[PDB]
């Protein structure tokens, strides 16, 4: 009930412009089948399911409890970093999954920690959004991609509220706004986050402008973290 | 658009605290030996700041042996430019300036005896900003 309630609550806040990323973890007694079905049941990109308990100085942490640490790591990495193979603080994960079991959980949007040579490592940065991945929406299945998207919306929203009904909606003023947004993205270029970006006047929605209804469009190419390597030994 | 320029008629110069009103030309620049070095990975050269050097030129019409008597002694030059159309004025002083050469003698034909002075100044102060 809380998860569904929080699901609606976060979804509501998105409509208000507040892009909140939700982290959840299934019940202790849920098996792989239950967890994957739960992730499949709600495949919002703003929702994440932890599908494994974990150990930390002999104290067990349920998947709901572990989601706190997972949420903190994802939030702490911010834009540049990601948790595709981050070495977690945990000492041991009770459900140890084979590659096939990992593939099912990962395909289901379940976020799973795996034990590797004494190290508990998060795998692939996934979220619950995996049912569709309709071409461009493939990137939306990863937490880092969503965090990158939400932060830009927040930054633009901050710059928006400085000018809604507070700057004259003239070509010079609109050019001032574009200069502000364009320079802001140029900072992201300085961070190496983005390979290419463009921001321009939305000529279509500009046909019916008002005091705070100037409209603009943009698109960017986020730089991703290296995830997999394929080698071929010719001999 | 409006007229708020300034004219050399408004120039006021105090050479060592004395109004040398006979100087009908002055200019002083504060240049920097900006090093420019080329980096391996960066396509465009990187320019690095360096130590500043102050030079000034000052020429006018002779009316006395002030500069010849002055010699190469250090002194100060206070420059004041005042807007008359609207109030406000710029005020600069060259903190420590010395002559590079005494215009000891200069004259030609029936022309007025012009005098030309060139030197350097260590530093400056901006006393008013208009």
């Amino acid at each position: 009930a809380l998860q569904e309630t929080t699901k609606a609550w976060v979804a509501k806040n998105k409509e208000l412009g507040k892009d909140i990323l939700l982290f959840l973890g299934g019940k202790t007694e849920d098996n792989i089948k239950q967890i994957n079905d739960k992730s499949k049941s709600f495949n919002d990109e703003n929702i994440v399911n932890v599908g494994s308990s974990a150990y930390y100085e002999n104290i067990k942490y349920t998947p709901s409890e572990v989601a706190v640490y997972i949420a903190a790591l994802s939030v702490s990495k911010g834009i540049t970093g990601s948790i595709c193979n981050a070495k977690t603080i945990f000492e041991e994960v009770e459900p140890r999954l084979s590659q096939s079991e990992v593939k099912e959980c990962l395909k289901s949007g379940t976020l799973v920690l795996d034990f590797d040579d004494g190290d508990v490592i998060i795998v692939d940065d996934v979220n619950t959004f995996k049912k569709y991945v309709d071409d461009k929406n493939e990137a939306m299945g990863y937490i880092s991609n969503i965090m990158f998207i939400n932060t830009i919306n927040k930054d633009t929203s901050l710059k928006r509220k400085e000018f809604v009904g507070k700057i004259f909606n003239d070509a010079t003023g609109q050019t001032t706004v574009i200069c502000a947004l364009k320079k802001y993205f140029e900072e992201l270029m300085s961070q190496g986050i983005i390979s290419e970006f463009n921001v321009d006047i939305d000529t279509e929605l500009q046909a019916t402008a008002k005091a705070d209804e100037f409209y603009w469009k943009w698109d960017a190419v986020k730089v991703d973290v290296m995830k997999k390597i394929y080698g071929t030994g010719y001999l | 658009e409006e007229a708020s320029f300034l004219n050399g008629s408004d120039v006021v110069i105090l050479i060592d605290g004395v109004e040398e009103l006979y100087m009908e030309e002055i200019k002083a620049d504060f240049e920097q030996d900006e090093q420019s070095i080329k980096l391996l990975g960066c396509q465009n050269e990187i320019s690095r700041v360096g130590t500043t050097k102050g030079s000034f030129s000052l020429n006018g019409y002779k009316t006395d042996s002030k500069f010849a008597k002055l010699g190469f002694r250090s002194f100060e030059i206070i420059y004041n430019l005042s807007n008359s159309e609207t109030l406000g004025y710029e005020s600069i002083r060259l903190k420590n300036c010395r002559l590079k050469k005494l215009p000891l003698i200069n004259s030609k034909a029936g022309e007025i005896v012009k005098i030309e002075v060139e030197g350097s100044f260590r530093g400056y102060d901006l006393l008013n900003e208009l």
Binding site: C84, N85, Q99, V123, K228, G231, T232, G233, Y234, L235 | -
Partner: protein, 225 residues
């Protein structure tokens, strides 16, 4: 695939050496296997020639194709010359529970040929409710897979797996119980058409080749005046 490190190894002959080659050549090949009556382009790869036309040295396709491939041609435009009388290897598999032994699935080779494709179906020892479908070319195994008893999945599973470039399954009818166990049932009825190639049949390849462009043309190892 999961994020992580993966690696494989290959023989140096498997290198992508097709880079840097030149030239275009045409051939009206006789072939035991592959598409019939059409021009096909190969990018100077032995395996590509092997998959597209088999590896029977008795047939002019692989034999002369290998020689032309050794000639370092950038692109080889092969035409499967045929005599006619063309047929594909085919077989029909039947259901157990029906005492009439209802035919439910028809298998067929991907291309016309006469090579000995064979089918062996045995009871899956782990579970009788499934059965192991092993596809054979002569005594050699060519593909194996277990399958559900429902007919639609069986045709799908045969057509699903990677190693079925040789044969395509087809449903004749529905049934509930698994196919009957059989061993090495040949896909009879096929024919490669290499038998008694007519002089005239070469002319079909010529006209087909005309719409294409190539630097040179060479006959199929035949000295007929």
């Amino acid at each position: 695939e999961i994020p992580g490190f993966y690696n494989r190894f290959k023989t140096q002959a498997e290198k992508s050496t097709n880079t840097g080659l030149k030239g275009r050549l045409a051939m009206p090949i006789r072939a035991n296997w592959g598409d019939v009556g059409k021009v096909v382009t190969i990018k100077n790869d032995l395996r590509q020639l092997k998959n597209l036309f088999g590896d029977d040295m008795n047939y002019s396709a692989f034999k002369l194709g290998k020689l032309a491939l050794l000639g370092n041609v950038k692109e080889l435009l092969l035409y499967r010359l045929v005599d006619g009388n063309q047929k594909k290897g085919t077989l029909t598999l039947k259901d157990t529970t029906e005492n009439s032994a209802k035919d439910v699935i028809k298998l067929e080779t991907k291309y016309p040929t006469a090579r000995n494709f064979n089918v062996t179906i045995k009871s899956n020892l782990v579970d009788s409710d499934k059965k192991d479908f092993i596809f054979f070319e002569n005594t050699k195994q060519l593909f194996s897979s277990s399958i559900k008893g429902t007919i639609d999945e069986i045709v799908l599973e045969i057509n699903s797996n990677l190693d079925n470039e040789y044969v395509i399954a087809t449903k004749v009818a529905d049934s509930d119980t698994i196919l009957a166990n059989v061993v090495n049932q040949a896909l009879e009825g096929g024919n490669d058409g290499c038998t008694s190639i007519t002089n005239e049949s070469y002319l079909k390849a010529l006209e087909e080749f005309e719409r294409y462009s190539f630097d040179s043309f060479v006959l199929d190892g035949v000295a007929d005046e």
